[PDB]
Design an enzyme around this catalytic site. Structure first.
Site, mmCIF file in Angstrom:
data_model
loop_
_atom_site.group_PDB
_atom_site.id
_atom_site.type_symbol
_atom_site.label_atom_id
_atom_site.label_comp_id
_atom_site.label_asym_id
_atom_site.label_seq_id
_atom_site.Cartn_x
_atom_site.Cartn_y
_atom_site.Cartn_z
ATOM 1 N N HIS A 238 -8.668 -13.121 1.701
ATOM 2 C CA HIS A 238 -9.379 -13.655 0.549
ATOM 3 C C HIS A 238 -8.490 -14.626 -0.225
ATOM 4 C CE1 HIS A 238 -7.811 -10.374 -2.335
ATOM 5 N NE2 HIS A 238 -7.707 -11.476 -3.053
ATOM 6 N N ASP B 266 -9.940 -7.717 5.066
ATOM 7 C CA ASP B 266 -9.145 -8.532 4.176
ATOM 8 C C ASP B 266 -7.695 -8.583 4.637
ATOM 9 O OD1 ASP B 266 -8.629 -10.232 2.228
ATOM 10 O OD2 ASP B 266 -8.992 -8.842 0.526
ATOM 11 N N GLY C 170 -3.421 -11.390 -8.577
ATOM 12 C CA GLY C 170 -2.167 -12.069 -8.253
ATOM 13 C C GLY C 170 -1.274 -11.191 -7.375
ATOM 14 N N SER D 243 -2.647 -9.574 -4.833
ATOM 15 C CA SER D 243 -3.331 -9.610 -3.543
ATOM 16 C C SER D 243 -2.427 -10.081 -2.415
ATOM 17 C CB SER D 243 -4.589 -10.507 -3.605
ATOM 18 O OG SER D 243 -5.570 -9.943 -4.466
HETATM 19 C C1 LIG Z 1 -6.052 -7.206 -6.374
HETATM 20 C C2 LIG Z 1 -7.015 -7.845 -7.340
HETATM 21 C C3 LIG Z 1 -7.498 -9.123 -7.107
HETATM 22 C C4 LIG Z 1 -8.379 -9.716 -7.990
HETATM 23 C C5 LIG Z 1 -8.802 -9.042 -9.119
HETATM 24 C C6 LIG Z 1 -8.351 -7.756 -9.386
HETATM 25 C C7 LIG Z 1 -8.820 -7.025 -10.618
HETATM 26 C C8 LIG Z 1 -7.450 -7.152 -8.488
HETATM 27 O O1 LIG Z 1 -6.980 -5.885 -8.734
HETATM 28 C C9 LIG Z 1 -7.853 -4.764 -8.415
HETATM 29 C C10 LIG Z 1 -7.005 -3.505 -8.248
HETATM 30 C C11 LIG Z 1 -5.918 -3.701 -7.201
HETATM 31 N N1 LIG Z 1 -6.307 -3.157 -9.531
#
Ligand SMILES: Cc1cccc(C)c1OC[C@@H](C)N
Length: 247
Positions: free
Chosen positions: A46, A97, A196, A198
């Protein structure tokens, strides 16, 4: 990373910092990554799907700071950007992903291991730690949901693996979480991966060995009660990894 601690690349030497260059010459941070062999970084589809042009990307290894240089750091171009053909995104959930970036220096070389640059082991087929296991996450992701900039310094934290059964409870994610995903969170909801982060590693110490168990994928907000971080379950992707890295 919400909560946790600032850290340095020597403690996370497999961590890759992935950036994208823009027309005009500005470079922005995109996502984390993990070095799984000298020529290969693994990250999340993604991160790249809207900009699948390998030429746009820069990968750093041995880097502890977002926008400045770290002694021993190495800079790579992307020789091959491989996205998962069956990647898809629902409202929350991201499926398949996972991505592979083949890296090369300007001189055509792959990574040279050092004190601050090391590979991380992959897990073995369907062999993941048990729920309740503590694992670490690393990234340059947001420190608070309300932040619009990323930390300058690498962070890490520790989260516990959550069962599929618990993660599929209706107040969590119901059936949106699948068996190809892994949930992890803080029991008190005080620490988490965030936007960030990810593409970066969820590392578990498995049978004495540091293993890349997960890749930061998705979730609802950051450090929200009943809303765990969701990770790509690396151990369910070994034939895909092998097929694309065999070349
Ligand atoms: C990894 C990610 C990518 C985009 C948005 C969010 C809230 C994200 O975090 C969700 C979760 C990992 N806390």
């Amino acid at each position: 990373i919400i909560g946790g601690e600032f850290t340095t690349i020597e403690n996370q030497p497999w961590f890759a910092a992935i950036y994208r260059r823009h027309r005009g010459g500005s470079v922005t941070y995109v996502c984390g990554g993990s070095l799984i062999s000298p020529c290969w970084v693994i990250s999340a589809t993604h991160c790249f799907i809207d900009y699948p042009k390998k030429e746009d990307y820069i990968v750093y290894l041995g880097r502890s700071r977002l926008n400045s240089n770290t002694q021993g750091e190495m800079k790579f171009e992307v020789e091959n950007l491989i996205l998962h053909k069956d990647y898809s995104a629902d409202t929350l959930a991201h499926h398949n992903d996972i991505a592979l970036l083949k890296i090369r220096s300007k001189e055509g070389r792959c990574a040279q291991p050092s004190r601050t640059i090391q590979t991380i082991s992959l897990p073995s087929m369907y062999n993941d730690p048990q729920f309740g296991t503590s694992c670490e996450i690393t990234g340059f992701g947001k420190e608070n949901s309300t932040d619009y900039l990323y930390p300058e310094q690498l962070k890490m934290t520790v989260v516990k693996l959550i069962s599929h059964r618990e993660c599929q409870q209706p107040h969590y994610y119901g059936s949106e979480v699948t068996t190809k995903m892994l949930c992890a969170a803080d029991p008190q909801w005080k620490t988490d991966s965030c936007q960030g982060d990810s593409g970066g590693p969820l590392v578990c110490s498995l049978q004495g060995r540091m293993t890349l168990t997960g890749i930061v994928s998705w979730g609802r907000g950051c450090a929200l009660k009943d809303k765990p971080g969701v990770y790509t379950r690396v151990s369910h992707f070994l034939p895909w990894i092998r097929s694309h890295t065999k070349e």
